[PDB]
Design a protein around this ligand. Structure first.
Ligand SMILES: [K+]
Ligand SMILES: [K+]
Ligand SMILES: [K+]
Ligand SMILES: [K+]
Ligand SMILES: [K+]
Ligand SMILES: [K+]
Ligand SMILES: [K+]
Ligand SMILES: [K+]
Ligand SMILES: [K+]
Ligand SMILES: [K+]
Ligand SMILES: [Mg+2]
Ligand SMILES: [Mg+2]
Ligand SMILES: [Mg+2]
Ligand SMILES: [Mg+2]
Ligand SMILES: [Mg+2]
Ligand SMILES: [Mg+2]
Ligand SMILES: [Mg+2]
Ligand SMILES: [Mg+2]
Ligand SMILES: [Mg+2]
Ligand SMILES: [Mg+2]
Ligand SMILES: [Mg+2]
Ligand SMILES: [Mg+2]
Ligand SMILES: [Mg+2]
Ligand SMILES: [Mg+2]
Ligand SMILES: [Mg+2]
Ligand SMILES: [Mg+2]
Ligand SMILES: [Mg+2]
Ligand SMILES: [Mg+2]
Ligand SMILES: [Mg+2]
Ligand SMILES: [Mg+2]
Ligand SMILES: [Mg+2]
Ligand code: NA
Ligand code: NA
Ligand code: NA
Ligand code: NA
Ligand code: NA
Ligand code: NA
Lengths: 198, 260, 183, 71
RNA sequence: AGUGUGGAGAUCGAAGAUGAUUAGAAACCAUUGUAGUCCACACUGCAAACGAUGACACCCAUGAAUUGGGGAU
RNA sequence: GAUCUGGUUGAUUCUGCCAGUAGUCAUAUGCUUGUUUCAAGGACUUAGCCAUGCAUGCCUCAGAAUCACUGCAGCAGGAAUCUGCGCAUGGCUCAUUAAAUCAGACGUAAUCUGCCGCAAAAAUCUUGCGGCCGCAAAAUUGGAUAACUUGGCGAAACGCCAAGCUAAUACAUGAACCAACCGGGUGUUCUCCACGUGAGACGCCCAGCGAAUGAAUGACAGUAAAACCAAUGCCUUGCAGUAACACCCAGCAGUGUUGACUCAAUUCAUUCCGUGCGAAAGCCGGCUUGUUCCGGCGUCUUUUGACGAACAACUGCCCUAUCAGCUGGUGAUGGCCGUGUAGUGGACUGCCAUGGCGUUGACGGGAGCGGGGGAUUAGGGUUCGAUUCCGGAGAGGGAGCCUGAGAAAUAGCUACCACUUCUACGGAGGGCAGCAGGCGCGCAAAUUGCCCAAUGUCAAAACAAAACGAUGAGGCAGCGAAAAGAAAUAGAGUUGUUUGUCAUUUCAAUGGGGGAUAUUUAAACCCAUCCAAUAUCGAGUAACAAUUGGAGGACAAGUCUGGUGCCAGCACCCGCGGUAAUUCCAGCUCCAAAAGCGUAUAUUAAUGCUGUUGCUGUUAAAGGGUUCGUAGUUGAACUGUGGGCUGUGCAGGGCCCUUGCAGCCCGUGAAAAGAAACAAGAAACACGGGAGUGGGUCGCAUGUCAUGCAUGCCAGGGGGCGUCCGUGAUUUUUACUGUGACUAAAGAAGCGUGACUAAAGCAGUCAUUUGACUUGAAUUAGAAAG
RNA sequence: GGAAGUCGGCAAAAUAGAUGCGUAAGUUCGCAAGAAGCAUUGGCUCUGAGGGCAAA
C-alpha cells in the first residue's frame, strides 16, 4: 500500500532506481486522520508492536494551558481561525498541530478570579470574590504582588473567547490539547487575522 | 527471529566438532550475550562429560539438578556466561566460569563461602520510578539500591545466596583487572593508565605480573581486586600470565619426553 | 552436501612429459626401491618441494624472528626424528639440500630390506603387504610407511604371522586339511 | 571538508578530497566525495573555507551532517 | 589537387582532339587543347605533411668546416 | 624448477604469430576398471511444467473430560474438543539487482522488540446478611460456548445449516478494612496569639503505575568590606553561632546519566472513556495436615537487557562515450508549518527558493546475487565464485491484505492474468526455486529407499512407568571412474640353458573371494577381527589372464614385415599417401602413463604476446602535419655539521677521527629565584556535589528531645598534585614509517599428535584402574576504509 | 453492415474553439508541424496572485 521508502525517489544524480524487492510492512504509511471540529469520534489503529494510535476523526473539547500561570483547563473548541499550511484547512475546520483556534475563556476567567481575587467581568455559578475569608484575602495579596497580566489576554477573557494554539497531534494521540497565545506570538497571529478581515 | 545456530557459525570456544552435526544449541536470551556465553547443554555434555548426548543432558537439566547462581535451570539453552557459579549438589561440583590465558572458558573449582560470591561489572546506572537508583551489571542483574559510590565500570561483590551487595571495587589506576574480550582475553594485569576519548572507545593500558604491557578497549576490562596480589576471586591455573609461544612449545615437548 | 571433511592432493606430474634423463633417473629409482609407479616418486617430490619452500621462506627471515625460530626448530625436529637429516647437522640450510633418496631410504620397504627381514626390496613390499611386518608390536601393511629412528629398532616379524608366533599359513593349512581328508 | 557550494538556504555542499591507492600499479589517484551539510546561522562560511562536520540524524533526503566549526 | 564567387588568362596543361608506334596502344612520343595554372575573398584539411625518428631536461670522444652575436690581439 | 620447443630462408640473424607443453573439487564425451577410504552430484538449458506420497506441530505432578470410552473398584489411564504456544524458523533457488546488494568499520540521543534474564507493584467500596441504612467479613462472581446429542443440506468441496446440553488459565466481572509515607487546593470552620507573610486543629476536594498537554527541576564553578529598612531566626532580657525545617522524622536524597540530551526521575495544573493496568475469582504438590503451614507452577500491568527487527551510510566494488549531458508539470536540491510512521527523513500535503549531479564519466546500455573463499601463479598478477557459512532476494506472474512481538507470509487469505484439476454442469479446486519422483529441455546431473540412533528446532514436553511428541531439518544406506587418499595383479629359490635369459623344478606366503562365537549398526550395511580357543575354507596358465594412447619431428619409443598406391586414409602444427609409406590399413616388436588413459570446450601458467614490476614504435605493427592550449600528470635550491670531558681504535694526516663514558640556559647573551629558551599535554582563574568522608605536603571538645551509635582532635604557611569549570596561543594537519587496539567459522599457513600409513581428524595419553595428565585443542596471515 | 456503390469516395458524413502535454521520416536547418497523438472544459461558493494615489 502506502510506503515511506526512498526506492521510488530519484537519486541525487537524477537516475531511476531499479527496485528488486516487493514492498514491506515495516515501511508502510496510512491515510491521514483529517480531524474536524465536531462531536468527539475516534478510531483505534493497531500500530507496530501491538500498541494503539487513536486516530481522531472529530474533536470538540481539549486541555488548553495558561503557561505563564502554569495551569490547564478543559475547554470547548469554538473555531479554527488560522492555518499556516493553507486556508482550506481553516474552511474545512481541520484540527492539526500548531493550528490557531478560539476556545472558551470562562474557565480561565473563573480560575483567575479564584486565584488572584480579580474579576475581569466586574470592571466592565460564577465565583464571588467578596465571599472569601480574610485568610484567603491575605493569600490573594501575596500572589498579586509578584504577578501582572497582559492586556491582550485580559481583553480576550472579558470577550469570552481566547485564541489558542494546538500543541498535540490529534491523528496520533486522539486528543486536541493546546496552549493560550501570549506575548509576541499573540501579536504575530492577531496581525494575520486582521489582514483577512480587510 | 532466528531459532537455529549452525555449528560453523557457533563460537569456537564451545569446541564443537564440525563433523558431529550441522547445528549447535542456540542460546536462549538471558543473562549473557550469545557470543559470550556457554550453554548449559554444552557445559553438562561437552565439558563435564556427565551426559553422553543431548538426551541425557536434557534428563539431567529438566530435573533441576544443575544450579546456576543458586537457582536451578531446566533449560539447556541457558546462556550461563562469565563469572557464573554452577553447582551440582548431587555431585558437589561448585565451579565458576572464568577465562584462561588462551581466551577459552575455564571451570575454576570453588569452595563454600566462595561459591556464594559473584562479581558483577556495572554497565549502566539509571533512576527508576520512585527515584530509585538502579545499577545494571554485565549479567543483566538490576541492583535496586547499590553503593552510593558505584559508577559505570566499577565492580560489585554480590552474595548470590543472600542477594545483597557486600563490597564495591572502583575502576581506578592501579587496580587489578582481567580482560574479558578481544585478543588479550583471559589475561590479568594492573591498570597503569586509561586514555579517555570522548565519543569513542577508551583505551586501558595494563601491565601483568611479569611486566608485559598490553592495551585493550576499556569495555573489555573487569576489576577483580585492589591489587595484583589481593584478588577478590580465584583465577585459573595460569594466573592470567600469557607465556611466550616458543617457550611453551619447548616446555610441552620436555614434559612429553619426561612422561615417557 | 554440508560435509566439511577436507581432502587435498599429494603428487604433481612433471612439466615436461618426455625427458630422456628424467625418465632414466625415475626408472633407476623405481628399480632400486621396488615402486609400483612414478606417482610414488612424484609424491616424494611434492613433499620435498614443500619442505624446501618452507625452509627458503624461513631462511629469508632474520635469525631473531620468532616465527623463524619456532618453525625452524619444528622442521629440524621433524627431519631428525624421521631420519631425513643426520643429527650432527642442525642448521636450517641442510633441509634445502635434501634429496629424493634421503626420503626413499626411510620407507618401511627399504628399511625392512636393509635390516634383512627380506632378501630383496621386492620381497620386502610383499612381506609388508601380506601382514608379516610389525613396527613396535603393531602390524603395518603400508609400504610407504616412513619409519622414525626411534621406531627403527622395534621393527620385527608380527606375532600373528607364520614367520613368528602365529599359526601356519595357507600352504601348510591346506596341506594339513587335505591330509585329514585323506585319512 | 572544504566548502564547495553555498547556494541553498541553511545548507552547504562540502568536498572531501582524498587519494585512493590502486594496488596493481602501486600508485594513487585523486578522488572526491560531495556531501550535503546543514549550516547553522551561527556560521557564515564562504566557498573554499574549511569546516568540521558532525554526523546527526537524517534532516533531509541528503543531509546527515551538521557544521560544528569553521576554520 | 579540388570547391564557391569575382578577376586574369602569357606559359604549361587533367579531360578532349588529331598524328604516330603497336597484335592492339584515345599509353609512352609528336601537334594541340578545356578545366586548371595566376590573383582577391570564402571553403577543404585527405601528402613519401619524412629525419618514415613526439616534447622538455641531464651526461657524453675526436679532427676539419660553416652561419649569426660578442671578447682579445 | 624464476625452464621452453616445432613451423617464414638456398642457407643466416630477427620480428611475429600459429602449433606443441603442464594444471584446473572443470564440465562433457569415448574406451577401460580387482581392493579399500573420503567425497561432489538437474546451477548452467527452461525462476520450464509438474501425477503421486511425505515434509509443523506440541501435555506435564501441575488450564478445561459425565467419550452414553477403557481398565479396576470412586480410582487410574483417556478419543475428541476447547485453551495456550509455535508455524516470520528450517529447507530450496539465485530470477531480480551498480548511491542497489554486500564487505570491513560505524550509528540509531530517530525507533520497535513476544520468548528469555534480573527486578518492581499500598489506585480500585467488593461480599454476605437484616431493615439507602444497619450489621458482619478465609470474597461461595456471572453469562456463554465446543466436543456431545438431535434433525440435517450438498454430486462433491482442508463444504455447510438449525435446535438441545456442558466447562475452563476461554470470556466477562469484581474485591471495603487490614494498609503506610508524602503533596497540592480550600472552608466567610473552630482554638489560640497579636491587634496579621500569625500559629494549631478540624472539615472536604484531589493526591498509584503507564499515557497526553502545560509550566518547574535536571547544579555551581573569572571580587571584597560596611550601612539602612522591613520581616525572620537566634543571644540576652546586640550578632556569637547558626545544615535545612513553626511539634509529632531535631539528616526520611541540598546530589540521575552521558562527550553530548528537550533524556532518567521528581513536583505542580488539567486530562485519559477502551484505545491500558486481577491477588488469573488459576493449577499442582508436600507435610505437620494449618479462617497467618510451606513449596512448585501459571498470569495482568510497569521496567531494562539479552535475542532480534527496522532505518541511515565512512571506504571499496565489472565492461561500454558508435552512451555527454542528468534531474525538476506530476519532487528534482533545499527551507517553513504540518501529516504519516515504530521511529528519522521530499516519506508525504500546502507554501516558498532555485537548486542537486556529471569527462575524478554523470545519465544510459550490457554482463552480474554480494562476501568468506577456489584455480593458477618466482614475484607482480590472471581467472572463478548458481553451490555447504554469512548477508540479500523470491516462491507461476503482478498487486493488495489480515493475523501477530515479528509477514506485505505464499505446504495464509483476496483479486486479476496465464496455465491447469474434478463435476451429478449447479458447483468445487491447484501452485515441488521442500524430499523422493515424473515430463520437457539440453553436451550435461542419483532412490517415488531407511530412521529420528545422533546433530538441532518447536512444544503443554526429562527419563521411566497401561504410558516411545513431531521433524524429507538432519542422519543412514542405494546410485555415483566430478574430485581426493591408500593400495593388488605375485615372492624366494633348484637345476640345466660374470651374468642375465630361457626352459624346468621346487617352496612357502597372502589376499580377491567364501564364511562366522561374533563385531558393527536405530536396524542394516560397510569397515575391522578370525578361519580354533576342543572344534573353523580357500590361486599356479597363481585364466583370479590391464588398460588407454603412441613409435618421421616437436616428443619417449621400429631404415621390421605384410596390404594400399595423392586412393583409402592420416596429420593440433610441420607434414605422410602419385608403388621399394620411418606417417595410412594390419601383424610382430618397442615406448609413455597406469586402474586408469584418450577427446571436445573453457580457464590459469607458458605469454616481458597487455608489460606497475616489465613491452614495443628509423627500416618488422606502431610519433599525431604544425603550434597554442584547459582538465590531468610532473615540477629547482634554501631555515639544518651542537659542543666539551675522560678513556679507546694499523684511525689518519697540538689537529682530525673511531667506539664507549660523563657532562652541558645543549648558539650567543641573563643569572634556587628571576632571565632566556620552551612548554594548548600550557598558563591564569575558580568549583566538595573535586580525592571510595577534601590527595601528598582513648579520652575530650562539640551538642545531646537525635543509632549525634555523629563530627573535630595539628596549628599555620608554602608549595606540589588529582578531577571539573571558566578565561586566554596575530594555535597544524595529512600521506609515509614504527608499534598497539578492534576484527566469525569453514578455508589457507602453522604447533603438537604413528587414526597401521595417507588424504583425515582434534584427538587422545599413561598407570591399571574405581583414577591421573589439575590432559590438550598452541600460534599466524587475511585488501581497502576505520 | 460500412465503399461491397462508382470511371473515380462524386456527393454526403467526418474533423474542429481554447488550454496543457506530446509529436516522425525527410530537410536548402528556415521547416515538416495544428504532424501524428493524449487530456481538460459547465454552474456555483470561495481562496490566492498580478496595482494606483495620498500621508513624515
Ligand atoms: K550420499
Ligand atoms: K601546348
Ligand atoms: K488454538
Ligand atoms: K519536519
Ligand atoms: K485456459
Ligand atoms: K524435487
Ligand atoms: K612486443
Ligand atoms: K594545464
Ligand atoms: K469505392
Ligand atoms: K507529413
Ligand atoms: Mg473546503
Ligand atoms: Mg574518336
Ligand atoms: Mg584537404
Ligand atoms: Mg618472409
Ligand atoms: Mg529462511
Ligand atoms: Mg538502507
Ligand atoms: Mg544462472
Ligand atoms: Mg519472502
Ligand atoms: Mg516453477
Ligand atoms: Mg505473497
Ligand atoms: Mg510447496
Ligand atoms: Mg498464486
Ligand atoms: Mg586382474
Ligand atoms: Mg591436442
Ligand atoms: Mg612501419
Ligand atoms: Mg582450518
Ligand atoms: Mg469501420
Ligand atoms: Mg461493381
Ligand atoms: Mg470497386
Ligand atoms: Mg467531396
Ligand atoms: Mg526529427
Ligand atoms: Na489562513
Ligand atoms: Na607490341
Ligand atoms: Na602495325
Ligand atoms: Na597453444
Ligand atoms: Na543462504
Ligand atoms: Na493538434
Amino acid at each position: 500500500g502506502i510506503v515511506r521508502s526512498r526506492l521510488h525517489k530519484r537519486k541525487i544524480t537524477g537516475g531511476k532506481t531499479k527496485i528488486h524487492r516487493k514492498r514491506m510492512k515495516a515501511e508502510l504509511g496510512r491515510l491521514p486522520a483529517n480531524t474536524r471540529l465536531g462531536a468527539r469520534r475516534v478510531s483505534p489503529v493497531r500500530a507496530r508492536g501491538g500498541n494503539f494510535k487513536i486516530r481522531a476523526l472529530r474533536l470538540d473539547t481539549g486541555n488548553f494551558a495558561w503557561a505563564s500561570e502554569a495551569i490547564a483547563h478543559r475547554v470547548r473548541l469554538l473555531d479554527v481561525v488560522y492555518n499556516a499550511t493553507s486556508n482550506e484547512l481553516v474552511r474545512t475546520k481541520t484540527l492539526v498541530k500548531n493550528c490557531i483556534v478560539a476556545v472558551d475563556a470562562a474557565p480561565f476567567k473563573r480560575w483567575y478570579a479564584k486565584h488572584y481575587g480579580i474579576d475581569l467581568d466586574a470592571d466592565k455559578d460564577k465565583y464571588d470574590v467578596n465571599k472569601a475569608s480574610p485568610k484567603l484575602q491575605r493569600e490573594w495579596t501575596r500572589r498579586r504582588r509578584n504577578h501582572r497580566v497582559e492586556k491582550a489576554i485580559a481583553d480576550q477573557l472579558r470577550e469570552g473567547r481566547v485564541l489558542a494554539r494546538i500543541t498535540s497531534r490529534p491523528g496520533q494521540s486522539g486528543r486536541a490539547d493546546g496552549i493560550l497565545l501570549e506575548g509576541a506570538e499573540l501579536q504575530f497571529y492577531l496581525k494575520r487575522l486582521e489582514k483577512k478581515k480587510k | 527471529a532466528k531459532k537455529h545456530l549452525k555449528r560453523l557459525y557457533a563460537p569456537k570456544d564451545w569446541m564443537l566438532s564440525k563433523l558431529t552435526g550441522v547445528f549447535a544449541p542456540r542460546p536462549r536470551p538471558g543473562p549473557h550475550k550469545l557470543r559470550e556465553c556457554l550453554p548449559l547443554l554444552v557445559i553438562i555434555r561437552n565439558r563435564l562429560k556427565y551426559a553422553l548426548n543431548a538426551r541425557e543432558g536434557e534428563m539431567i537439566l529438566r530435573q533441576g539438578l544443575v544450579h546456576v547462581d543458586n537457582h536451578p535451570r531446566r533449560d539447556g539453552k541457558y546462556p550461563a556466561g562469565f563469572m557464573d557459579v554452577v553447582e551440582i549438589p548431587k555431585t558437589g561440583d561448585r565451579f565458576r566460569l572464568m577465562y584462561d590465558v588462551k581466551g577459552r572458558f575455564a571451570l575454576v573449582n570453588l569452595s563454600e563461602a566462595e561459591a556464594q560470591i559473584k562479581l558483577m561489572k556495572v554497565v549502566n546506572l539509571y533512576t527508576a520510578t520512585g527515584r530509585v537508583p538502579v545499577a545494571v551489571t554485565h549479567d543483566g542483574h538490576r541492583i535496586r539500591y547499590p553503593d552510593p559510590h558505584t559508577s559505570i565500570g566499577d565492580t560489585i561483590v554480590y552474595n548470590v545466596k543472600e542477594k545483597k551487595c557486600v563490597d564495591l571495587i572502583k575502576n581506578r589506576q592501579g587496580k587489578a583487572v582481567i580482560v574479558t574480550g578481544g585478543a588479550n582475553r583471559g589475561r590479568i594485569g594492573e591498570i597503569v593508565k586509561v586514555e579517555c576519548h570522548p565519543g569513542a572507545f577508551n583505551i586501558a593500558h595494563l601491565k601483568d605480573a611479569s611486566g608485559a604491557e598490553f592495551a585493550t578497549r576499556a569495555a573489555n576490562i573487569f576489576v577483580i581486586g585492589k591489587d595484583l596480589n589481593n584478588l577478590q576471586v580465584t583465577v585459573p591455573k595460569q594466573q592470567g600470565l600469557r607465556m611466550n609461544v616458543i617457550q611453551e612449545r619447548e616446555e610441552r615437548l620436555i614434559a612429553a619426553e619426561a612422561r615417557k | 552436501m554440508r560435509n566439511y571433511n577436507n581432502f587435498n592432493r599429494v603428487w604433481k606430474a612433471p612439466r615436461r612429459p618426455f625427458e630422456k634423463e628424467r625418465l632414466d633417473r625415475e626408472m633407476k629409482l623405481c628399480g632400486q626401491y621396488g615402486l609400483r609407479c612414478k606417482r610414488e616418486i612424484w609424491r616424494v617430490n611434492m613433499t620435498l618441494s614443500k619442505m624446501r619452500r618452507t625452509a627458503r621462506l624461513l631462511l629469508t627471515l632474520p635469525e631473531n624472528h620468532p616465527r623463524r625460530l619456532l618453525e625452524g626448530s619444528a622442521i629440524m625436529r621433524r627431519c631428525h626424528e624421521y631420519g631425513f637429516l643426520d643429527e650432527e647437522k642442525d642448521k636450517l640450510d641442510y633441509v634445502l639440500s635434501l634429496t629424493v633418496p634421503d626420503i626413499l631410504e626411510r620407507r618401511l620397504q627399504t628399511i625392512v630390506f636393509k635390516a634383512g627381514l627380506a632378501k630383496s626390496v621386492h620381497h620386502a613390499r610383499v612381506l609388508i603387504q601380506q601382514r608379516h611386518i610389525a613396527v613396535a608390536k603393531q602390524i603395518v601393511t603400508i609400504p610407504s610407511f616412513i619409519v622414525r629412528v626411534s621406531s627403527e629398532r622395534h621393527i620385527a616379524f608380527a606375532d600373528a604371522s607364520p614367520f613368528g608366533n602365529g599359526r601356519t599359513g595357507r600352504v601348510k593349512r591346506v596341506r594339513a586339511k587335505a591330509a585329514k581328508r585323506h585319512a | 571538508g572544504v566548502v564547495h557550494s553555498t547556494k541553498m538556504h541553511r545548507t552547504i555542499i562540502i568536498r572531501r578530497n582524498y587519494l585512493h591507492f590502486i594496488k596493481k600499479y602501486q600508485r594513487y589517484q585523486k578522488r572526491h566525495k560531495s556531501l550535503a551539510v546543514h549550516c547553522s546561522p551561527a556560521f557564515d562560511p564562504k566557498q573554499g573555507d574549511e569546516v568540521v562536520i558532525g554526523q546527526c540524524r537524517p534532516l533531509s533526503k541528503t543531509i546527515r551532517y551538521n557544521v560544528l566549526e569553521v576554520v
